[PDB]
Design a protein around this ligand. Sequence first.
Ligand SMILES: Nc1ncnc2c1ncn2[C@@H]1O[C@H](COP(=O)(O)OP(=O)(O)OP(=O)(O)O)[C@@H](O)[C@H]1O
Ligand SMILES: Nc1ncnc2c1ncn2[C@@H]1O[C@H](COP(=O)(O)OP(=O)(O)OP(=O)(O)O)[C@@H](O)[C@H]1O
Ligand SMILES: Cc1cn([C@H]2C[C@H](O)[C@@H](COP(=O)(O)OP(=O)(O)OP(=O)(O)O)O2)c(=O)[nH]c1=O
Ligand SMILES: [Mg+2]
Ligand SMILES: [Mg+2]
Ligand SMILES: [Mn+2]
Ligand SMILES: [Mn+2]
Ligand SMILES: [Mn+2]
Ligand SMILES: [Mn+2]
Lengths: 683, 683, 289, 289
Amino acid sequence: VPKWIQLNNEIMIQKDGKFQFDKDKEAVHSYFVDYINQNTVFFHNLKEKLDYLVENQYYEEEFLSLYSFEDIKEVFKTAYAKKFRFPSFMSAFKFYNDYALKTNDKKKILERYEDRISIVALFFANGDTEKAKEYVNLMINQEYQPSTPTFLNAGRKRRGELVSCFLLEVNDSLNDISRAIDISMQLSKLGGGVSLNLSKLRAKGEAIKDVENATKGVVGVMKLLDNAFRYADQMGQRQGSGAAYLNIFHRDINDFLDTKKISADEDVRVKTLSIGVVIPDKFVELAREDKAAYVFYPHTIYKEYGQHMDEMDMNEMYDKFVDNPRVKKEKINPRKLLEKLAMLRSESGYPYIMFQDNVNKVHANNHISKVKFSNLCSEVLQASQVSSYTDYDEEDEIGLDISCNLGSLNILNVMEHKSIEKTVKLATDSLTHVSETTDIRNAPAVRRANKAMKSIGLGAMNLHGYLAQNGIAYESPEARDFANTFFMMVNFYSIQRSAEIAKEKGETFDQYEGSTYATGEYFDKYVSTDFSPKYEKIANLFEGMHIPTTEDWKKLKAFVAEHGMYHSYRLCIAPTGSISYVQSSTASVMPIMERIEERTYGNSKTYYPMPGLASNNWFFYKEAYDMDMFKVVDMIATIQQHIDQGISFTLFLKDTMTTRDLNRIDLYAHHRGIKTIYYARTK
Amino acid sequence: VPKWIQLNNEIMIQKDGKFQFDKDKEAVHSYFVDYINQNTVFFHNLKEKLDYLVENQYYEEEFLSLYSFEDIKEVFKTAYAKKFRFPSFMSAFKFYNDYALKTNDKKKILERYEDRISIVALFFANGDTEKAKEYVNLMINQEYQPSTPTFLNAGRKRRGELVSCFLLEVNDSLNDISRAIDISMQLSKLGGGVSLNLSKLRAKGEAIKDVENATKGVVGVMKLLDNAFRYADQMGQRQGSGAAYLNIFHRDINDFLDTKKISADEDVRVKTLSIGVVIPDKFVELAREDKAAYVFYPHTIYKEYGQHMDEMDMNEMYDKFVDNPRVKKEKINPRKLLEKLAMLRSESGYPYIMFQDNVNKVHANNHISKVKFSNLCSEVLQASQVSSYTDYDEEDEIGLDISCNLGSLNILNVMEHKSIEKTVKLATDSLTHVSETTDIRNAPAVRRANKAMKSIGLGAMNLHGYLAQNGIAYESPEARDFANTFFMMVNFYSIQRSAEIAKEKGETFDQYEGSTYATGEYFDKYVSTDFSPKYEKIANLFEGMHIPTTEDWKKLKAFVAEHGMYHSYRLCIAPTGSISYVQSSTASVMPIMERIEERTYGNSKTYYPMPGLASNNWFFYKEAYDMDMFKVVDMIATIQQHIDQGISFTLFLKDTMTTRDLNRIDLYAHHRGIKTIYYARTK
Amino acid sequence: DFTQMFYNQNVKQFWLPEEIALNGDLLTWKYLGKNEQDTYMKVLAGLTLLDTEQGNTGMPIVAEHVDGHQRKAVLNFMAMMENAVHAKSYSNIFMTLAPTETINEVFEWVKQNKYLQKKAQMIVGLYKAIQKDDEISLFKAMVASVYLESFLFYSGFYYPLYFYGQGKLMQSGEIINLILRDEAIHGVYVGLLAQEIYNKQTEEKKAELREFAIDLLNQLYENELEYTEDLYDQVGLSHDVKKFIRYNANKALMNLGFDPYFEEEDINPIVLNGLKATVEPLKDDDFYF
Amino acid sequence: DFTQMFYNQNVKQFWLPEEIALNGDLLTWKYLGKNEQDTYMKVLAGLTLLDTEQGNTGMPIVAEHVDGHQRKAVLNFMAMMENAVHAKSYSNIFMTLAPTETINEVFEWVKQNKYLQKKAQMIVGLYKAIQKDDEISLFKAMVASVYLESFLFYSGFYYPLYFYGQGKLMQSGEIINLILRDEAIHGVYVGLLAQEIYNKQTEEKKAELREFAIDLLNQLYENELEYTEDLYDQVGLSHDVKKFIRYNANKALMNLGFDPYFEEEDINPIVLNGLKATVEPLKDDDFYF
Ligand SMILES: Nc1ncnc2c1ncn2[C@@H]1O[C@H](COP(=O)(O)OP(=O)(O)OP(=O)(O)O)[C@@H](O)[C@H]1O
Ligand SMILES: Nc1ncnc2c1ncn2[C@@H]1O[C@H](COP(=O)(O)OP(=O)(O)OP(=O)(O)O)[C@@H](O)[C@H]1O
Ligand SMILES: Cc1cn([C@H]2C[C@H](O)[C@@H](COP(=O)(O)OP(=O)(O)OP(=O)(O)O)O2)c(=O)[nH]c1=O
Ligand SMILES: [Mg+2]
Ligand SMILES: [Mg+2]
Ligand SMILES: [Mn+2]
Ligand SMILES: [Mn+2]
Ligand SMILES: [Mn+2]
Ligand SMILES: [Mn+2]
């Protein structure tokens, strides 16, 4: 057992009835005195290091060639002047095991934290030394964290794509299904998580070229996609991850759900394909009134109306579908379907729940399309247009496939530096740069939507960490007040930066003129409701920072009207799995699952306390499972009212609560305006 | 139970110790006087029938519009003038259950045998009334039988494709793999059996752009193809059938074979994809000498030499592969691999065995490409060039994917009518028409190969029926002499018709100038060796027909040199599974499995005696399992010497014999020049 | 050819009542109508009473007369499951859903019920008629046993499976599914032992044993139809239950190596949702001809 | 007052030999002398015979005659353990350590060994003499069963325990300890049932039953002495084993409620060292907040 691992395991050993949290710090020192410095490759000067990394195909020549060597050296010096120290052993371990650049033999460390941050900053700035230094100060203060793809791969020649969330629309044809399989394989090859909408696909027992009972339904397509994702597994590094979304009014919805049951046969169950269910308000109304619902055959609806079932508003179309004899449908019990969803989420955490009307009643780009499905993490909610992939030697009709750009603000570090505006604007600029530098040659609709929509996702993390280190309970009304104010400022500065980029470049996102930003509707609740903190403690937390008022929001609305907005979407709160360790932050805006988490690496045990955990804030670091899920829903809705896309919202349940409690949480989330529900993790 | 069912079951009720074969005839009468005539749909005249079939989307109106109604009436009258009667109940039952056109609800019979034959003939003639009458006389006499796709689907609006088998070359890339999956689904949707050569795909543990041990090998692609064929299953009517072919020198050859082991795990086992193994002469030489062999990693060979492992001759490059340190290889025991092949064929009948050198030592189009794999029935052996399917928005390099049209000569009916020449020429014309009117819009390499190669497959059926009905034992040297003479005549007249078509159209198949037809090498054994019958009985059997001599072959060689050949490939002997029932013929050139076969249909059981089975020829209808497989190999080699493509050669084994006997049969087949071995069916 | 394989499958299916918590069934039980609760109670008591006969007599009597140490061990294991596991499981379900007085009354009713008694006594009669060293009488008892395991239980299993397939009474439905899975393998195993005896007989004796089996099946089937209407008409399910009885009768016949008696029928989808050749090395000179 | 706690103890002790990997004994077995291996094989074969008859005959027959479904469930479970678990475990040991010919030979040896045949004849004879509703014949068979459980096994158990205590053949020894743990509770349980019957008798009848028990014990004891000498003389342990069987004879008597018969002796200290989630329906009030 290594010395740092012993020093880390000494945390659980209680002295005077208290955990030895400070010992973790010592572990970090050991982890750097015994391992990191010994296995870190050192060079006589930075010029030699850069030459070795470029020549050995570690870095890219293009992004480094935009700067003189003096500017690169100045950026590296700015990164190293902070003298950044990892506060916990797990932060440094996760960085140097997951993100630090290693030799081809994986035994030496080529990149420190400062080196990786400097390289990512130089990639972000695209030739501006001052902008690169600003990015270096942003990331070394740990105010902003690029996502795992961006942070890991920026500036590296041997790399995947910087985007890892991809949403694909699948049209109801064999050509479109095969193209979807191909694109899923290509994007999993790039290292991205792929979500596919299967609602347009006709159900099982439908007609193919006017022969009856011929379609295999969406379950056969799910089997094909599951095989494709198993095959494309990042060159045998990570398990291929894919998601499939189906509307709850699709007839296959039960069989869809049956793919996640344990009792399902081998020809029914898909193991590497996550599933999500899109639930329109009509289904919730039918379940609430206990009226029996109807699941429709999509191809009959398409033949009758010329549009797909998921392309029209089910609230106004459901009665017409039911009363139409030419539309084929099957009787179901919506309450039984809700109970089945709750039971499946209890067993396996699936499916993801998308409340379609909750997403689309605040969607700014409904003119382009309504949000029909979400991503693999159930937080990307954007307009998508299906593509018509025709036969060979025939021109395809390329639509819009969602691929947003991830990046997370560290709420604790951002707010302690009183730099919400600067961090949000710099993160928006970096996300815009990464979106502009993304070029996928095997996903035509993804590339077209990246060029047109210019959608980015700016998330936040360390919400619970910040609240606990400031003596605020996550379920307290003060925490929701802080979340409201902080995320309203984040939205304000994100919109301001998007409008500034649109003014500078002279271009907005495609079909912006029809958006609620152009019409000013988006700013309605912002020009009438003041989002300043209602509690003195939160106001003192925001001291030293200008909180945008209704007049500021009116000025921003006028600015957007005059200049437009560069990004169709700006904010989405991703789970932030492993980057939260490196940043010493709690994951996403979720409450912490455990105060101290026990992990097993190799044959060794390691202990990670939550950041800033001590005896004084032990009570404020309440575990997520012990919390009331209604108050967690309230906080997530408070944040969601300022996020244009969704939030990865995992439910944290105890083994005691039943499926009725899960359904109640889901229905309260639907009532409170929650757009997506990610997971049902049972303790 | 139906009256005809009782009459057919009365065959096995012996009277005076003999089977009541004549009862079978009675059954047909019943089957027509109680079911077919009552279930048939009669019109006032042919005009009303044709109009009803045209407007109700049963028939394509284009092929019928090329004839005036008087000509169509004359063709139908020619078909009905023969007064064709089905001699066995099973012939009529199979036609009216599998090939006769029925209504949309399948409650009535719209097409008689004469109606189907007339429609197929009118489609074949393409506006020529005299040619349509010739086709009608050829098919109503049952001298020639179009394949099941062509016979069933010719002239139908709801038809599929007329091509039975498709062969795809899969290049070593994710884009090519995805395109192969798409094309396999498209062609299975069209109803054709798809064969894919996986020998170019790099083995398991190869590098995908400098990251090693990343590839899943051919087994992952096999699983993808298996799921694709499961999904595309002819709209749920016929199970999707696919074939995978791998060279025996591929490193994955064991894992390949492990896909068919009955103890294989679900993550490896493949159940809807047939497997074939391509064995060069080098492997047989290594096994014979008991020298340990080496299987190779295709990607290392491609990197070192710039060509795929199956793209070059292993007999001359195996030592270079072994001595090359930059080529990666694994040690295997070739005798152990042969024993594994024999055990697998005993257990499940797989893999198909393709003796590559036996195919390519007489292959006439080696300049275009060597034959690297076979079809799903292991009788199509043609040159194929792999396609380079590139990224989206990039032009693809379209290669040649094999596809040929099947058609079988009924040997008994052809020789009874003394019309080898006329039947062969008319069948060649019909297959040329089927190739010309075939246009597949989702398989580009298949379309290009169909347009360029113009390859057709003219098979033969009722070899054993003709031999047994003429008092010739199938294993006798007289039977092999008859096969030699008959198939030399078939080859002569097929080459003559191909050259005549090339002369009349002024065009040959692509790259004909480099073929052995152009250089005259193909005719060598035909201009030096006489293939006239060596036995007086066979010569009497061939009386009334001009058997080509060496002078006729020299004249044909000169004619080909002057005019060329329209078809790259002309003769391939398919299994002819279910259409042999309608023709009252034994399946293909294979010996009969059983004298009387008991088949269960619905809740009833039926007995089909072999065509012409009686007391005097009971022992001439020797069952295949009771026959010496070495003499069957001799027969198949004798036929194969006159067939440019392969023959679907099924091995018929007894349970008592061991895997050593199967290996001996395989090695004798390789020694005798057998190109492919189809199945190892054990009694 | 089969006893060690069945030994393995039996012992790996071992389970105990305590593993399934039953109390959460009260959350759906309270929402059923009186007729539904009545039918469930009566069906449950029917299964309990029949399974007790199998534990006290059916399995032990067959174990006694069958020769072979390994067969006796498998049969002992099956008898153990009846008495130690199944019987306790049925009792647990009852005690959870009904008060003591209600349980006593239901058992009094089902104990007096004409259709339950007819089948229970028919089966027990054949077990009591086994004679030492007489394989014909043993075979007849094995047929009776297979009919109980693979056929007679299923008019009863229908209802718990029907609820289980709807999301109702899931804990007791899980228990019933485990019990049913044991009875299925019991029926298959005893069926193979019966076929062994059958195959030792002359052709005339075989035809006579077939007539016995079909005649017995007919008597039991006609009583099952009456039993079914008596219990299921009040909840409107009898038509579908009858299809399920015939489908399971066919399985019982197949267990005894006999042809199916009834035409194939589809089953209620809710209930459905509830439910080497000798290797010889190449010796060389096989490559030369 | 006791059956329920025995039921719970028996079912919680459930095990299968496959839970214990035996390849670890391969070397300590290889290292034993031919005499030691011979005695070991024969000892376990004698145990196998006893468990075969206890499972096939003894426990099922006692189960048949004892009243009460719970008492029958315990006895049925014990019967299953005898032949489905205990007797089979010995074959697992044999198949690991010995070649097939040695296994075949030892099973042939049990058939022809006069002491093993005599003890089986005596014990099984008493089992088969039980008469329905005759409590005295039942008592006699229960005494025989206690003597098998708590006395007769021990001439066999000595040797695996003797090795286990020296750190030899410890995987096989683990199996044997599990078997011994079972037999100890089986002997107590059957002993309590025997005492029930004995306590119903007149003083005169009791005096006769004690005579029966002591005469039977002495007869079995004298035979076991000869068996012990026959097996253990070649390994030098006969006198030590004899002390062990006398010790256990006293335990058998005590299980029957009788005073110890043999004087206490020091036993070899080596041998002493050898010892889904819950589902509720959705209410209409769960849709409003
Ligand atoms: N907690 C930590 N986080 C990150 N790096 C660390 C940490 N502890 C030590 N190191 C690394 O090890 C070096 C030694 O640091 P130490 O605590 O011994 O003193 P120092 O004054 O920071 O040293 P130096 O002269 O290297 O700057 C640091 O410069 C840094 O590179
Ligand atoms: N074996 C058969 N094959 C094909 N069609 C048959 C067969 N048997 C009967 N039919 C059909 O059923 C009709 C019944 O007539 P059948 O053969 O009994 O003799 P028919 O009335 O004297 O006239 P004909 O033989 O001249 O048609 C036939 O005309 C024919 O259309
Ligand atoms: C992407 C991917 C490829 N492969 C295998 C199958 C293909 O035959 C083979 C080639 O993939 P390619 O698509 O050719 O990958 P590449 O072109 O980026 O890499 P290279 O330059 O080396 O050609 O890699 C996998 O096994 N799994 C995968 O996920
Ligand atoms: Mg379409
Ligand atoms: Mg490549
Ligand atoms: Mn039972
Ligand atoms: Mn049972
Ligand atoms: Mn025992
Ligand atoms: Mn015991």
